Amino acid sequence: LTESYCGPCPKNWICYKNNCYQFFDEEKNWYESQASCMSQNASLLKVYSKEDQDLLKLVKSYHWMGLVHIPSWQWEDGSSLSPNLLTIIEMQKGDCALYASSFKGYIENCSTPNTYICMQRTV
Amino acid sequence: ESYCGPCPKNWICYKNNCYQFFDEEKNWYESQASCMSQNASLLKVYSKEDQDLLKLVKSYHWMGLVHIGSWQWEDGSSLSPNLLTIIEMQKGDCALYASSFKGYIENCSTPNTYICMQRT
Numbered sequence: 172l173t174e175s176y177c178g179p180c181p182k183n184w185i186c187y188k189n190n191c192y193q194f195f196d197e198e199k200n201w202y203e204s205q206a207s208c209m210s211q212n213a214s215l216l217k218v219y220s221k222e223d224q225d226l227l228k229l230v231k232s233y234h235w236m237g238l239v240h241i242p243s244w245q246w247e248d249g250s251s252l253s254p255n256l257l258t259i260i261e262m263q264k265g266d267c268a269l270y271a272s273s274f275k276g277y278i279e280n281c282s283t284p285n286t287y288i289c290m291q292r293t294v
Numbered sequence: 295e296s297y298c299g300p301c302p303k304n305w306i307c308y309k310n311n312c313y314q315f316f317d318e319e320k321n322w323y324e325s326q327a328s329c330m331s332q333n334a335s336l337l338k339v340y341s342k343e344d345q346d347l348l349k350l351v352k353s354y355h356w357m358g359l360v361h362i363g364s365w366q367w368e369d370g371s372s373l374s375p376n377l378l379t380i381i382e383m384q385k386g387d388c389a390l391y392a393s394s395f396k397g398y399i400e401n402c403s404t405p406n407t408y409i410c411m412q413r414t
């Protein structure tokens with residue numbers, strides 16, 4: 172119940188535990204979605220902590236996140252996917268993944284248009 | 295970039311308002327009491343611009359709008375015009391929020407999920 176601040180974030184972004192999130196409903200393929208986040212000084216959603224990002228339990232439908240398959244799964248920044256964070260489930264043949272609740276990743280062709288989530292970290 | 299809040303750690307912050315969703319279904323009175331136990335109130339809608347995140351809310355949830363006059367919030371203030379479209383769903387004196395900027399008239403005794411809000 173103790174009060175603190177959250178951010179810094181741009182005003183039009185949701186802030187939660189010092190990460191900034193923005194939802195985009197205009198459907199784009201994975202690459203176009205990544206480019207859109209980058210144009211906003213951001214990246215596609217990166218899942219690094221179930222506790223610090225527990226708001227993702229409330230995220231419904233299916234959205235691009237920054238997770239890609241190198242033919243291991245890894246993020247845009249080049250870091251690998253930590254274990255016990257996401258359950259990765261096959262769906263459509265492809266090398267990208269859609270976030271869905273709760274902490275699931277559905278494999279999807281990178282060229283399929285989807286909604287997407289951008290995230291900015293503050294540290 | 296700026297800071298948002300203040301808010302408690304487990305709440306979403308948007309434009310200096312704090313929001314928390316509660317999945318346990320409760321009637322309007324129990325929901326109000328739950329928010330009060332967290333130094334908060336049920337959702338109050340005052341601005342489509344400051345609260346445009348409410349366009350993204352899925353399903354329907356108790357907010358702090360009641361019929362005693364007009365519809366009014368817990369804090370005694372009146373519902374501002376041109377904020378919510380009010381729709382009759384159940385015989386009731388309470389209202390659920392639904393996107394986008396709708397209020398469903400609902401029996402206060404019906405269990406529903408709810409949204410608490412804190413400001414400053």
Ligand SMILES: Cc1cc([C@H](NC(=O)c2cnccc2-c2ccc(C(F)(F)F)cc2)C(=O)N(C)C)cc(C(F)(F)F)c1
Pocket residue numbers: 185194226227229230231232306313314315347348350351352353409
């Ligand atoms: C993380 C986030 C997810 C959603 C939106 N899900 C929902 O609304 C949702 C779905 N099932 C249950 C509850 C909720 C919910 C209820 C109240 C709020 C609150 F914020 F009022 F507390 C937030 C979520 C979703 O999944 N999409 C946007 C794709 C919306 C928001 C927010 F409204 F904040 F922007 C945040």
